[PDB]
Amino acid sequence: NRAQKLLHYLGHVMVNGPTTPIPVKASPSPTDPVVPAVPIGPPPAGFRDILLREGPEGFARAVRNHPGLLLMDTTFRDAHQSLLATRVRTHDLKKIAPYVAHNFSKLFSMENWGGATFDVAMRFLYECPWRRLQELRELIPNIPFQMLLRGANAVGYTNYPDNVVFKFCEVAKENGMDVFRVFDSLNYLPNMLLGMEAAGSAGGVVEAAISYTGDVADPSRTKYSLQYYMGLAEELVRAGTHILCIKDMAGLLKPTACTMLVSSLRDRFPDLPLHIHTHDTSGAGVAAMLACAQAGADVVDVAADSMSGMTSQPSMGALVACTRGTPLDTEVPMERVFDYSEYWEGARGLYAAFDCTATMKSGNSDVYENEIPGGQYTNLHFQAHSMGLGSKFKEVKKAYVEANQMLGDLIKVTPSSKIVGDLAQFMVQNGLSRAEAEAQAEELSFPRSVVEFLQGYIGVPHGGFPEPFRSKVLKDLPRVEGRPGASLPPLDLQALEKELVDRHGEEVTPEDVLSAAMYPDVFAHFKDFTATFGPLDSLNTRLFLQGPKIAEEFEVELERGKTLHIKALAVSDLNRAGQRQVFFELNGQLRSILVKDTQA
Template sequence: MKGKALCATFDVAMRFLYECPWQRLQELRELIPNIPFQMLLRGANAVGYTNYPDNSVFKFCQVAKENGMDIFRVFDSLNYLPNMLLGMEAAGQAGGVVEAAISYTGDVADPSRTKYTLDYYVNLAEELVKSGTHILGIKDMAGVLKPRASSMLVSALRDHFPNIPLHIHTHDTSGAGVASMLACAAAGADIVDVAIDSMSGMTSQPSMGAMVACTRGTEHDTGIQMEKVFDYSEYWEVARGLYAPFDCTATMKSGNADVYENEIPGGQYTNLHFQAHSMGLGNKFKEVKKAYVEANKILGDLIKVTPSSKIVGDLAQFMVQNNLTRQDVEAQADELSFPVSVVEFLQGYIGIPYGGFPEPFRSKVLKDLPCIEGRPGASLPPMDFQKLEKELREKHGEEITTEDILSAAMYPKVFDEFQEFAANFGPVECLNTRLFLEGPKIAEEFEVELERGKTLHIKALALGDLNRAGQREVFFELNGQLRSILVKDTKAMKEMHFHPKALKDVKGQIGAPMPGKVIDIKVQEGAAIEKGQPLCVLSAMKMETVVNSPLSGTVKKIYVKRDMSLEGDDLILEIE
């Protein structure tokens, strides 16, 4: 049996939960000392969305192993072998068990799908086995591995590699996951991934209870007692209820076989919907899914898993936001301001896709921008960890650990924001789930245990009126003492938004192509600019977009500042 911790969603703990991912791993390891833990390692991307210096990947694996990680499932979003080999070497050198995982897309049982064929997967597996992987994995991110294709693929791998453990991972987005995993087991797979019943199905993994029941009495009998499965499922059913506002079942009521068409990974599907909603496209998610198919074709039919899936998703939302078809994008590629992820992919920042980059689209987008030849990390200078440690101590104080340094190396901006939040609000992991997500109700009393023997008794009393700064005075009792504090009402501040809009019929007014936060301004008032020159950078839900100038001229007035939140079409600047 195997546990999972410190997955590829490394940044989520800091970004959304304001918790240290390393502390989570340490606590889990202490509580669960004898079950192997497994994590995803995105090859040369480590646990991020870009390439890192080689020494950062090696150091990360070393520290992860020291903190209790055992198995490293190494993959690459493009199945780019040099990136995978680096991750395998880093995990192996750290003393971990190496599982090289091939990302699956297409359909090996469909003769019309000629790019990712059975030979493609067997040949790639041959290279990984030669390189010394301990386990061979198939990572079916979107759940497009149908039963017949499962039999063909696993049988071929079993015939070629009779002695290596085969591990198959899928998602149940289409509803056919149990059938596919039963076919994998029958064809010779050693391990298939499942999820406890109350957490299974749709974009999760197939049902554990269904797999246990369907294999009972057969040669693949798991020996697991159904009563134990039921008890475990009941516990997680209650836990799941706490996260109902974020549950994909709010928008996805059943399996969707359209995944065979759009190939959106299970891990991205709900995130993409939430991202679309935050960008004002919540009512256009059907269009986003259709655009995802077209964006994938524009980019050359990619293997889609983080970060390549994010690139396809960013382009799809960009297309829907700006009412662009595939033909529009390809025809206007030299004029459009594409998301940063799309531009960096075309520059070669995450590796070389199988079959090469799409032309002439790539040349049109990049124009004179530099390109990386070969493995991206090979051309990056080593990370200076001593210098980084010194900078972090100066910025956040002396209590910086080795683990903190690695967090900052992987996600510098997210780590800084996490540290600032922790300095302002303290250890929010002490709050129970409902209080953290929703806050207390008026007149509600609750306790917060900071540490053993140190408990705060708090009672929420009243909320004041909204002031001009978007704040409310919050009144509460703390251990019987009346207190108040000013708190920003972020929801109300969004409703107070009154930024001027760019007029589409006024040529020099440049509007925001999407809702987002201004993270950089590239020009100054009075500056002469050329057509295509970057003006500013917007960020929304991990998607960054550079707004380029559609014409040459002079910057007349800038209407935005850094960290300002904009809606779509909000006026950024005027050019004359």
């Protein structure tokens, strides 16, 4: 039976607390979201038909030749971890796709998957990213989708055998993914080369991105010279791409840097469409974005107004309004923007249990000196509340810059940002200073992640890395040379499928196979949980998090005919072994379920 299973989960939520951590004792607001009116006819035509009718080269040519400006929405991937910890369920997400496809037709693409999208969709949200992507494609047959992929590590933290990435990209393209963004934490050229090789082999639009760090207009800056970026761009275009992007994870894009860099790229490449992406952390995102659009930009990354500002991406409303009497002429009815923002403003109140509005009340400066990524700054906020960090949080970020300096000024996005962060965490919790740490580093123990970085799994940095520290810490540990992906022995994924089928698999799919091959432990945990309490991602947000309040009747629908009503009667007391009796009312029946309390 299935209903008994979900009632069992509901009773467990009743008696016990929610499984996921709850940072703040708050509750979802008792306000339903408002779905705006939609037309009845077929949706209009956008850019997906070009891909269906021509090749990626033709689509890139059309985008380059298109007069004006283009936008692509990111309020589905980046605003999530930018402002939340990415706990947005698909159930809430599956109520705008009918609207946006019928109204928004000029969008460049849509961001569905990303870095903090697989593990979180299996560790705290007991769901399946493959399933999440599967039903959205039937809802937006108008706008191509885009996913964020890293070169060596696919979505994880360590390098992987290349053929695994090949199968991953092939299956992702087969399921319906359209545009691929290729990027690496460092600027290790073979990593990007492998990324574009996999993207081209799979078949689809290949997008290259270059992480930007420091001020490119300051003469004092010397580690990342001007000609360094143009040389990297020349190498990238020689490798063969379709669109060039400039990732700005920290939001350090000055208007002068904007205009001069975009002029330099457009000066020597009047063929490639330009892509841009920034996080509005300092508060000057919109001005730099206008400058970039004026100079040579073609595609712009935009989030909705309800998840703009703070540390998220610039709002749609400002760009639409400012580019009104402009030769760019976005020319999109901004009345629909208002209701689109209103929906998300209503929906944001559901996830009030955990939000960045706790201590970072407004946008923070001092990123030009901290250079901490936006997605990691929120998690540091989270940990600061977790340990109750007050003025001692200031020392935490005071310890970040010195650690970066000692390891050398390097670009930090997913892995290396985490490495610098937990190195600083370790050093500060030990209450140590820099000079003595430099002196006695052999006897001193370091976190395993620092050792992994110094070994060389991720790759070699541009300016090299210090020899005395690695000599004094590594001792006699093995070292990986050349490309770690090439040096890593290929693994057999066929044994994984039969192993899972033997253990608990009876209709495991290749997506599930490679998902378990990505992280076996959390895959096994999630699958066992689903086999324990039932199929999730069919319930409301307040039902999933808070639970049905007593003396209240709710309605849950599963199919066109599978419609049922739930009412909560009462809960008994601990009889003999911490066991509770809970009475539930269905449409016309009464059922009692036993719940094992965890406090014994």
